Amino acid sequence: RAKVTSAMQTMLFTMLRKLDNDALNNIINNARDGCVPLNIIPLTTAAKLMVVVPDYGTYKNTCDGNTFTYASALWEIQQVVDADSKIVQLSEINMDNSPNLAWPLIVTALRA
Amino acid sequence: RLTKYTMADLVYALRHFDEGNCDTLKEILVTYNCCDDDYFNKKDWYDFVENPDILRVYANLGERVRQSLLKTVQFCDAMRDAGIVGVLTLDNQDLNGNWYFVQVAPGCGVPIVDSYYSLLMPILTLTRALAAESHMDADLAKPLIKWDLLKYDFTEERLCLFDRYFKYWDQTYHPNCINCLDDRCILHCANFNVLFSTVFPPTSFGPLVRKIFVDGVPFVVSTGYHFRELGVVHNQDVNLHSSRLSFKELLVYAADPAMHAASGNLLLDKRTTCFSVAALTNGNFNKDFYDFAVSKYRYNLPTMCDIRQLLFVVEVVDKYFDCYDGGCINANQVIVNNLDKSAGFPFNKWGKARLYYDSMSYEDQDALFAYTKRNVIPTITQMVSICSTMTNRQFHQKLLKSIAATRGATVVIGTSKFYGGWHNMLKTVYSDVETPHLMGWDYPKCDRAMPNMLRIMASLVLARKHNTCCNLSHRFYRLANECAQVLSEMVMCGGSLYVKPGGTSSGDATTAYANSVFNICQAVTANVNALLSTDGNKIADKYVRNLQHRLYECLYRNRDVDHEFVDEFYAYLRKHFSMMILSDDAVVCYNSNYAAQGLVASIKNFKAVLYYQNNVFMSEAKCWTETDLTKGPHEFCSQHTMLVKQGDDYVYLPYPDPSRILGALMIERFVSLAIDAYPLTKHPNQEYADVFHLYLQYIRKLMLTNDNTSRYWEP
Ligand SMILES: [Zn+2]
Ligand SMILES: [Zn+2]
């Protein structure tokens, strides 16, 4: 039992270090009674956003250029990694080079 | 200045749908510009799986449907003020919502709307009747409501809709199902919540969380859950400023997505249509056999039910379950064989179910079970974890084992085909039907598109055994727990957490049984509809003529359950519509002399019922009718049936398709294949017999003999 107990505690504390922040306090403090839906916490506490894009047209309407808007925030792209785990530059994502990209691409961005 | 068609014709066209005789529906959709005429030249234009665009087209009737509901409420106020007492029907209201009864006293009237709304209910989520209500003043021509993300209750919003559209539905409504007096009331309210919830944000639903503290350190945990069907359910055993967490509390928290999603990455996934919450991050080919042989959830839609019918059918469904035993068992009474099963995320990062069953004492297992009778734990599954399965067995296993140990019953789970079992099961369904024919059918998307309302009905049926061990509040929390754990749980896919819209779960304890409750419900519904939809004045048999009359009056009148009527109706179905049911697999032996008159359901009733009950179209390609009982069902338990001589008598034997068998302690697998192939040697086609013999040669080279195999069919 002890092995499991330790694993659960280790995991919960790792998450607590990530979780305990000002953003969490702001969403809970704005609640009428301290209760919020879980599905809206990441929209306020996640500083980092993962965007998964299946093709070029979607990319243009999702993450065109250095910044984009999502969850009522402006996001700044830090990196793009393809389906083969290679680094792709923003300057490399265009119509002409679309056939050479390992779609879907995953875009990593931070809150502006 | 009335329209050509009435609300009754729209409801009939959608509920008694036939892709052949679909002229009423096609004309209405063209007439009101839902689609053009060329729309009906598409292959399978009426399907929901193929050509999913049909939903866009049905939705174009949504404004028309809410206008009819609003006109009804205004009509009802007018007749109330006028002192008029009477009944509202769908053939007295046209498709523009226009209306066309006795007087008692000014200010004292009352509408009867029980059939009025129940008949419409199945098409209100189909046509998106409340599509306008997501807009600021409930007008599609204006912008959407900027709903507060932190709003999680919506009690007032549901009450406002209830009193706007169903004002005269004179039955107590409990937006939060936790306040229901019995299981019937639970289904009564949930049915409204399904429709009302269609206009609330997707983020407003799901686990509800709070900041709590342990040793001064904040955690985000679930302290309740918001269900699309059940409303808001709060937890009671929520303890803040604790010093340490117990093993049990740690299991509850580890399983709780509140800790994982709130602490993860934001996720925008454009590859899907499903709602996501957070990212948590940044075959065996048997060549030897082959060479030897060669040498020789996106479719799960909110679905509203006809409640007057659902509450009748469920009593009939319960009768079909009035032979087995059930109730609650303790932790030390639970039998678990699959201890090699993954414990589920995050427990599967540490071990298999054995790791947890051998760690918790029986007292701790009982305590976790008790927790779920007072609170809700919204666990995480992966594309069902131990914090769900450890307690689902204590609640359901006695019943599941009872069903599995009972032979001769309508629901047959766990009954071997061997030693005459196939034969006995067939004789059991054939029974004494006067003019027997055999029928069977598939269920498209049975594990994906099954509505949460029918999943709730099935879990309530399985829970109806808990009468001498559970109070009302406890039964409700157990329902809330089953719903949070298998209908709207979190599922990890890859490294991210997504929300499941509904359907079934192959990892749960009850799926194989809940599916049989469902199969009966749909069949009863088909028979209730087959009889109620026919002309009662064309029935020569006075008995059935009276049965149809009384059946109508046991659904839309006489709300209290008439148990004598239900026993009689049940017996009627038992005699003329005999069912043999396995999880999503059924054979029906029916009396065609009555089906021919519309007094018994046929395949066309199943097609119409699945069309509006599960939002799926059932193709004739997988449906069958067999007129000669010399041969058995075309396919049951994925096997074909033939009558052969055995013991200077005749028996029915199953057999799988010969190509499927060859396409399929390694020797143990081959022995099982050879046994399944054995009956093929009784078949007149030598090519079938050769499958069995091929395996014996392989097995012996890897002792299985003809005698060690023929014994499997000797009682
Ligand atoms: Zn209720
Ligand atoms: Zn009980």
Numbering used by the authors:
A (entry chain B): 80 to 191
B (entry chain A): 118 to 217, 222 to 403, 413 to 426, 456 to 542, 560 to 840, 854 to 891, 907 to 919
What does the paper say about this structure?
In three-dimensional (3D) classification of the SARS nsp12-nsp7-nsp8 complexes, we observed that a portion of the particles appeared to be missing the nsp7-nsp8 heterodimer. Further 3D sorting and refinement of these particles yielded a reconstruction at 3.5-Å resolution, which largely resembles the larger complex. However, in addition to missing the nsp7-nsp8 heterodimer, this structure also displays a significant amount of disorder in the fingers domain index and ring loops, which play a role in template and NTP binding. We hypothesize that the binding of the nsp7-nsp8 heterodimer to the index finger loop stabilizes the polymerase domain to permit template recognition.
